Amino acid sequence: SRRRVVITGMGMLSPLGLDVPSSWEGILAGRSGIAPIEHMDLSAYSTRFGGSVKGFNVEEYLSAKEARKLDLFIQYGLAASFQAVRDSGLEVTDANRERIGVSMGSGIGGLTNIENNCRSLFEQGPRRISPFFVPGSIINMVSGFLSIHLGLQGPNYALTTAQTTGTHSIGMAARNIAYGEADVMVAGGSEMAACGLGLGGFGAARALSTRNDEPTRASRPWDRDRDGFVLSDGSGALVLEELEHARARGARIYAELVGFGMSGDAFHMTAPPEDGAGAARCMKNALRDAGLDPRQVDYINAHGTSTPAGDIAEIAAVKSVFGEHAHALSMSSTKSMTGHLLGAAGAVEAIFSVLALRDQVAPPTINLDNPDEGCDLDLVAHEAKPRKIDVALSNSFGFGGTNGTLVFRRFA
Amino acid sequence: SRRRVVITGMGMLSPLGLDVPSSWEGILAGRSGIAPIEHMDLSAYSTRFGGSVKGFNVEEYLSAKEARKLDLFIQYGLAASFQAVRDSGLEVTDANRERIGVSMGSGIGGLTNIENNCRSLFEQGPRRISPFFVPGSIINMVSGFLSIHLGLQGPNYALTTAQTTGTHSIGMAARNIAYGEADVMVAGGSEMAACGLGLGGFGAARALSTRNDEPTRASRPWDRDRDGFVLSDGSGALVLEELEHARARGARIYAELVGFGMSGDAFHMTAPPEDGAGAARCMKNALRDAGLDPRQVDYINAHGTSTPAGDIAEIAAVKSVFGEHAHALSMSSTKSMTGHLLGAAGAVEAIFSVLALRDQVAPPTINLDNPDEGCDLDLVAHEAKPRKIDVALSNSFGFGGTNGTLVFRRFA
Numbered sequence: 105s106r107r108r109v110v111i112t113g114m115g116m117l118s119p120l121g122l123d124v125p126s127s128w129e130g131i132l133a134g135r136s137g138i139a140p141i142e143h144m145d146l147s148a149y150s151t152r153f154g155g156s157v158k159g160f161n162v163e164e165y166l167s168a169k170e171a172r173k174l175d176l177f178i179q180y181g182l183a184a185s186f187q188a189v190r191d192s193g194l195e196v197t198d199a200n201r202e203r204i205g206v207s208m209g210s211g212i213g214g215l216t217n218i219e220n221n222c223r224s225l226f227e228q229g230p231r232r233i234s235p236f237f238v239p240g241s242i243i244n245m246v247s248g249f250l251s252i253h254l255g256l257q258g259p260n261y262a263l264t265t266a267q268t269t270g271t272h273s274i275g276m277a278a279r280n281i282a283y284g285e286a287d288v289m290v291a292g293g294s295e296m297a298a299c300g301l302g303l304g305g306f307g308a309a310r311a312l313s314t315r316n317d318e319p320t321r322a323s324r325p326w327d328r329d330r331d332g333f334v335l336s337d338g339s340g341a342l343v344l345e346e347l348e349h350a351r352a353r354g355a356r357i358y359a360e361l362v363g364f365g366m367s368g369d370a371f372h373m374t375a376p377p378e379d380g381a382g383a384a385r386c387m388k389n390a391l392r393d394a395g396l397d398p399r400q401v402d403y404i405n406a407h408g409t410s411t412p413a414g415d416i417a418e419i420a421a422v423k424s425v426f427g428e429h430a431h432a433l434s435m436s437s438t439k440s441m442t443g444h445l446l447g448a449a450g451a452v453e454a455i456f457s458v459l460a461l462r463d464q465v466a467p468p469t470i471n472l473d474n475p476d477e478g479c480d481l482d483l484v485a486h487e488a489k490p491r492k493i494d495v496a497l498s499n500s501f502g503f504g505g506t507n508g509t510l511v512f513r514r515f516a
Numbered sequence: 517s518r519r520r521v522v523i524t525g526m527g528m529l530s531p532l533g534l535d536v537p538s539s540w541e542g543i544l545a546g547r548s549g550i551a552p553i554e555h556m557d558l559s560a561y562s563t564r565f566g567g568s569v570k571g572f573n574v575e576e577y578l579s580a581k582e583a584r585k586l587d588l589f590i591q592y593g594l595a596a597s598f599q600a601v602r603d604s605g606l607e608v609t610d611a612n613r614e615r616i617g618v619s620m621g622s623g624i625g626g627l628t629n630i631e632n633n634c635r636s637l638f639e640q641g642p643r644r645i646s647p648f649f650v651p652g653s654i655i656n657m658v659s660g661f662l663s664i665h666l667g668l669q670g671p672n673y674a675l676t677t678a679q680t681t682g683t684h685s686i687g688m689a690a691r692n693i694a695y696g697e698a699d700v701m702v703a704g705g706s707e708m709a710a711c712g713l714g715l716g717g718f719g720a721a722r723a724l725s726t727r728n729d730e731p732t733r734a735s736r737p738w739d740r741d742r743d744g745f746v747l748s749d750g751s752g753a754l755v756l757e758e759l760e761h762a763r764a765r766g767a768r769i770y771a772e773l774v775g776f777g778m779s780g781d782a783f784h785m786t787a788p789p790e791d792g793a794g795a796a797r798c799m800k801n802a803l804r805d806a807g808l809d810p811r812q813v814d815y816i817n818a819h820g821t822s823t824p825a826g827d828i829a830e831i832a833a834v835k836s837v838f839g840e841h842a843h844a845l846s847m848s849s850t851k852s853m854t855g856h857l858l859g860a861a862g863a864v865e866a867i868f869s870v871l872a873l874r875d876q877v878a879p880p881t882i883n884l885d886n887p888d889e890g891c892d893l894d895l896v897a898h899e900a901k902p903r904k905i906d907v908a909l910s911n912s913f914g915f916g917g918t919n920g921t922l923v924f925r926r927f928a
């Protein structure tokens with residue numbers, strides 16, 4: 105058998121706020137974090153907007169010297185991790201440090217640092233490249249730097265599954281705990297691809313909404329006028345903890361992580377299949393993992409990227425998995441407000457899923473003024489919806505057809 | 517409840533060969549794959565050699581049309597995965613495709629591709645960035661593209677844990693199978709970091725051997741005259757399979773994967789602790805996972821990177837874990853010949869560890885002319901050593917203090 109896993113700590117940077125409570129306040133009020141990108145020449149760019157982290161003060165976490173060594177994506181992940189550990193009340197000791205590990209991931213990693221060192225390399229040659237270039241840019245350094253700062257000696261690793269990273273990181277962190285390899289994990293993702301290469305890279309595949317005139321209306325999941333996703337920056341981190349360990353120290357328990365599903369589409373490199381057959385296997389895999397019937401599910405935090413193919417596949421997948429219960433559950437895209445944090449999407453959407461359990465409220469899908477063909481589900485258009493939520497799903501479907509589902513249940 | 521996991525297929529690109537048997541012949545013959553780099557101009561670089569893959573034909577595997585869109589690390593990963601799958605004899609069907617997944621990882625991923633696109637952006641503008649920049653560079657697309665070409669709908673993901681990536685990728689794929697999420701996984705890693713930023717960033721950190729006038733003698737693990745690691749390119753892939761599923765189809769079984777350990781040093785971003793404390797915790801986790809007496813270990817494929825700190829830390833970790841039996845087992849670093857394939861190091865060295873079991877031979881540490889202070893173990897100096905091997909161990913240690921150990925034994 106298997107150990108139960110609870111959420112005792114959460115931390116976040118998002119386009120809505122510099123922590124969980126501020127972010128969640130924006131989500132429930134349907135506020136957008138999307139705005140034209142600043143201190144950056146986007147003249148030659150079809151997209152000039154996204155969700156930036158506004159007002160981040162790294163010196164709340166690190167000395168200036170330590171922050172100078174680390175890509176913004178690493179900074180954002182340490183921030184959410186430090187918040188989550190502090191939010192949990194956990195005390196690390198010689199007696200438990202071998203049982204506390206970290207799995208913080210990223211989709212794309214250190215593009216901002218890769219750019220600035222590229223500038224150096226091309227202008228002046230190799231001897232101007234930072235000595236800290238490699239360890240300050242690679243994706244396993246949020247786990248690395250966190251483990252070194254707090255003295256964590258348990259499982260130490262990093263996932264990179266594109267837009268599925270956050271969901272995969274939390275899910276496989278839960279497995280470490282359930283099968284007795286750890287009592288505590290910090291898990292989630294961080295991302296800062298709002299650079300030239302990120303905007304350019306996604307710009308060149310014309311993946312991005314180009315609604316420059318109305319940045320707050322660009323992200324419109326399931327709306328007939330959607331024209332691709334909105335690039336956003338940030339981090340989410342959860343403290344996952346074995347239930348008996350959490351109870352023994354009297355932890356505040358937000359919710360229980362009951363299920364994790366994974367699937368591969370084996371379809372296309374960036375597009376999901378029109379019927380969402382891969383997202384459907386993943387959700388069924390996640391429900392079976394939790395020993396739950398589809399009928400027991402109340403809330404889904406969609407991937408809901410605002411791409412023509414993605415949004416429609418997810419409707420197909422939900423109708424397929426949930427049959428005559430598909431209208432009864434509420435499903436919303438918090439990306440209507442946050443845009444798409446890529447590797448960190450799944451981490452902040454796990455937190456929104458946990459807070460939907462705490463607060464008994466479905467976050468809105470904003471900008472859903474004209475549901476597309478067959479988008480006739482309860483997508484919680486425009487405003488938040490109080491309702492009963494025992495069981496909440498969080499879905500992520502990424503490049504390479506990599507799928508993740510997390511199942512959270514109310515704990516009392 | 518926990519199932520057993522065997523190896524039924526292996527695949528490789530190394531500086532010694534374009535497959536396993538060719539690579540392994542070089543290993544047993546003590547041949548160096550290290551040579552001055554020809555694919556770029558390094559006269560401005562303090563290090564000008566590495567373990568290049570020689571004469572790779574991507575069109576043994578993929579269309580030139582697809583190949584052109586993919587960073588070499590992805591081409592190298594697919595090449596290794598296709599070999600391993602072929603070598604397995606496995607036929608993907610509707611009956612088994614949901615039960616076959618992939619976990620192929622990388623330390624750094626498509627730096628070459630990110631660099632070249634960066635050069636396009638800075639010299640020409642954002643409009644010259646490939647539309648294939650993101651899907652052709654990000655680390656999870658080895659898992660993604662393999663799943664699409666072969667129709668694998670099992671768990672689909674990628675680790676990035678720096679120089680531990682290969683060992684972790686293989687260990688965790690075994691856990692997928694062990695605990696019922698899959699019956700088959702293609703697992704390992706791939707790296708092509710030999711670009712300006714790669715050789716530049718490792719150079720800026722003074723991590724690399726600067727023995728430009730004798731590259732075949734650069735990599736000399738435990739030798740008193742070692743001066744840093746040698747940067748190499750390539751890929752390893754293994755087909756991991758549930759034992760009864762392997763029996764059920766009359767699979768040829770190279771060996772059984774009985775043990776996997778992880779730990780964190782929680783010490784330093786790039787430096788290992790001189791006492792090998794985190795490495796010791798990791799091997800002990802692995803031996804306890806395998807239910808072994810540490811005296812059962814016959815062969816250790818060491819991380820053996822040829823850095824001053826790394827090499828001596830490993831000796832300490834192995835004396836601390838094995839006590840007097842540390843003087844009975846054989847330990848060698850095939851990095852003496854291949855150099856350090858970073859995130860692929862663990863994947864090719866897992867294969868060397870399995871072939872050590874098949875052939876009953878300890879591969880040599882070449883260039884070990886003058887063992888350093890305290891390096892008094894059986895390090896298989898100079899020449900392969902025929903000997904009884906029932907249990908083989910493969911260690912990796914990375915930036916962020918992240919440790920991985922795999923335990924193989926003969927299967928009958």
Ligand SMILES: CNc1ccccc1S(C)(=O)=O
Nearest residue numbers: 276279280283688691692695
């Ligand atoms: C028991 N561990 C397990 C089980 C299923 C999937 C993944 C893992 S992992 C990567 O954490 O090793």
